[PDB]
Write a protein that binds this ligand. Structure first.
Ligand SMILES: [Mg+2]
Ligand SMILES: [Mg+2]
Ligand SMILES: [Mg+2]
Ligand SMILES: [Mg+2]
Ligand SMILES: [Mg+2]
Ligand SMILES: [Mg+2]
Ligand SMILES: [Mg+2]
Ligand SMILES: [Mg+2]
Ligand SMILES: [Mg+2]
Ligand SMILES: [Mg+2]
Ligand SMILES: [Mg+2]
Ligand SMILES: [Mg+2]
Ligand SMILES: [Mg+2]
Ligand SMILES: [Mg+2]
Ligand SMILES: [Mg+2]
Ligand SMILES: [Mg+2]
Ligand SMILES: [Mg+2]
Ligand SMILES: [Mg+2]
Ligand SMILES: [Mg+2]
Ligand SMILES: [Mg+2]
Ligand SMILES: [Mg+2]
Ligand SMILES: [Mg+2]
Ligand SMILES: [Mg+2]
Ligand SMILES: [Mg+2]
Ligand SMILES: [Mg+2]
Ligand SMILES: [Mg+2]
Ligand SMILES: [Mg+2]
Ligand SMILES: [Mg+2]
Ligand SMILES: [Mg+2]
Ligand SMILES: [Mg+2]
Ligand SMILES: [Mg+2]
Ligand SMILES: [Mg+2]
Ligand SMILES: [Mg+2]
Ligand SMILES: [Mg+2]
Ligand SMILES: [Mg+2]
Lengths: 154, 114, 68
RNA sequence: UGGGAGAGGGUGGUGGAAUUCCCGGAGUAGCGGUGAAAUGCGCAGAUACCGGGAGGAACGCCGAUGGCGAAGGCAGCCACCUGGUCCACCCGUGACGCUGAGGCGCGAAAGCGUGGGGAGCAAACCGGAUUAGAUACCCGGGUAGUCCACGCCCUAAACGAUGCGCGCUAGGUCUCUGGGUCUCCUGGGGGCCGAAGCUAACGCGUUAAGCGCGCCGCCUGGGGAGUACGGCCGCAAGGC
């Protein structure tokens, strides 16, 4: 907006752990207003996380989000007669938004039949070092690194 | 071999060329924006000049040199960056001098410069 | 902080007084404008002519490299 | 008679910065160029660096709303020859003045002739891009020419788009250059703001586009057209 800065929306902490990050992840999982279905998907994923890699599901979730978070990103910009991918920093809020969006998208790209297992498998994949979301983050950061010459064009 | 040398920085608007010379001006090694895999207008960026200066200084240390006097010619974009990269590469920078050649109203410039 | 101010009486046509005349040059060997010096326009003309004479004679420089 | 300032002009010399080329050294994987590139240049060793030599052209800082000249124009420094102009003294002559149809001289750049010179730049020309095309704008090259001597050409937004001379009509302010009783007054230039006045308005306004006198040049709707014809000038281009 031209006039002012947008005021961020304060989500309500979830009624199982009191964590707003869980609420944001559920909102990213949800579509068409089906909030109960999204919450059940997340909690089934949490149960499967409890079975395999029997550590705390919250710990695995937070580790996945921390692993997927990107520090650099390229933004397009036309100067003269050429378009340039200017590398720029990422604010922590956008870091969280990108991490959650990439996690959900990568989970939905997996070929497992049920969604509740897709989310859990993607979460424990991103927990250690792997997954589609980690690959996306590496691609983005590599693109930002391969454009350090244009860091003055911002 | 010598531990004291000279650093010439030639920073045009299209490229930055760095040469390390012995105290008699005979070059030991050199590096430019194209020596690192850059072509075109990217050779003129400050970051390319920083990389070229770091590469030339690294080769100079690989030869066993420790201090360089810096001479800067030209007013390109990568001038200050190359000078700073030399300052923080592992070489003692005793002095920096500006020596860009300017005529005392000599030859007629090209049309683009008129 | 003016070159004319911080000096005594001297000849403006003297082309051998290197110590006095060099005070009217910048760090790179360039003649100072009226702003830095403080002479009048005629005095500046005489100073410039004498400086060029001394440059030809080999005492004052034509240019010196800028040192940071 | 005594002094002043000045890129005013002509002739002869000579100082450094920088570009280019050649010689030698050292050294290697690109340089250059653009909006992005490509042509081009480079391992047959380029670019960047150091030393030596040659040559041509132009004079950075000072430097300016500065100065000089009738105009065109004039800029490193030194010497010589030479023009104009300003002030002070109030010395001499005694109206000897102003303007000026024709005439004569000068007159940027480009251009022309004969010799010389030629670094850089660069009409024409060649190539690369761009584009629908690109006989251009951008890039890489490139010949006249740009420079010197002599001789022609004689044009321009040759403009202050304001002919020259003389007298009269509030001031304020900035600046260059003289004289004095050097706070300040009194000459001569160059700018800005403004009395009265003028102007269609914009604006001008003691540097008039105000108030007057003298002499010269020019205008009489736009186009055709600065064309045609005639005449004169020029080697030609073309000029009047
Ligand atoms: Mg709104
Ligand atoms: Mg380039
Ligand atoms: Mg080759
Ligand atoms: Mg070589
Ligand atoms: Mg030659
Ligand atoms: Mg004249
Ligand atoms: Mg005269
Ligand atoms: Mg008398
Ligand atoms: Mg008598
Ligand atoms: Mg009369
Ligand atoms: Mg008559
Ligand atoms: Mg002429
Ligand atoms: Mg002219
Ligand atoms: Mg000519
Ligand atoms: Mg000729
Ligand atoms: Mg072409
Ligand atoms: Mg096309
Ligand atoms: Mg060209
Ligand atoms: Mg050329
Ligand atoms: Mg030629
Ligand atoms: Mg004129
Ligand atoms: Mg007229
Ligand atoms: Mg008139
Ligand atoms: Mg007349
Ligand atoms: Mg006056
Ligand atoms: Mg006045
Ligand atoms: Mg005015
Ligand atoms: Mg006025
Ligand atoms: Mg006036
Ligand atoms: Mg009138
Ligand atoms: Mg009529
Ligand atoms: Mg005619
Ligand atoms: Mg005829
Ligand atoms: Mg004829
Ligand atoms: Mg005509």
């Amino acid at each position: 907006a031209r006039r002012r800065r947008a005021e961020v929306r304060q989500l309500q902490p979830d009624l199982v752990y009191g964590d707003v990050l869980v609420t944001a992840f559920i909102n990213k999982i949800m579509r068409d207003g089906k909030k109960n279905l999204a919450a059940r998907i997340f909690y089934d994923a949490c149960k499967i996380i409890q079975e395999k890699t029997g550590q705390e599901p919250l710990k695995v979730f937070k580790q996945a989000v921390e692993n997927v978070k990107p520090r650099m990103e390229v933004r397009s910009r036309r100067v003269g007669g050429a378009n340039y991918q200017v590398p720029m920093e990422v604010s922590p809020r956008r870091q969280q938004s990108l991490a959650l969006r990439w996690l959900v998208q990568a989970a939905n790209q997996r070929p497992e039949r049920r969604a509740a297992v897709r989310i859990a498998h993607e979460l424990m994949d991103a927990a250690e070092g792997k997954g589609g979301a980690v690959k996306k983050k590496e691609d983005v950061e590599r693109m930002a690194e391969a454009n350090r010459a244009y860091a003055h064009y911002r | 071999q010598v531990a004291s040398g000279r650093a010439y920085i030639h920073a045009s608007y299209n490229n930055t060329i760095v040469t390390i010379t012995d105290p008699d001006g005979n070059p030991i090694t050199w590096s430019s924006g194209g020596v690192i895999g850059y072509k075109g207008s990217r050779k003129g960026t400050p970051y390319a000049a920083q990389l070229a200066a770091l590469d030339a200084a690294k080769k100079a240390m690989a030869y066993g040199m420790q201090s360089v006097d810096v001479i800067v010619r030209g007013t390109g974009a990568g001038r200050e960056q190359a000078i700073r990269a030399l300052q923080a590469s592992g070489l003692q920078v005793k002095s920096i001098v500006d020596d860009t050649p300017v005529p005392h109203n000599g030859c007629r410039p090209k049309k683009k410069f008129r | 902080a003016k070159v004319k101010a911080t000096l005594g009486e001297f000849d403006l046509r003297d082309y051998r007084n290197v110590e006095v005349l060099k005070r009217f040059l910048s760090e790179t060997g360039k003649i100072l404008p009226r702003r830095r010096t403080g002479l009048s326009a005629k005095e500046q003309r005489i100073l410039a002519k004498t400086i060029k004479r001394a440059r030809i004679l080999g005492l004052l420089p034509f240019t010196e490299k800028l040192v940071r």
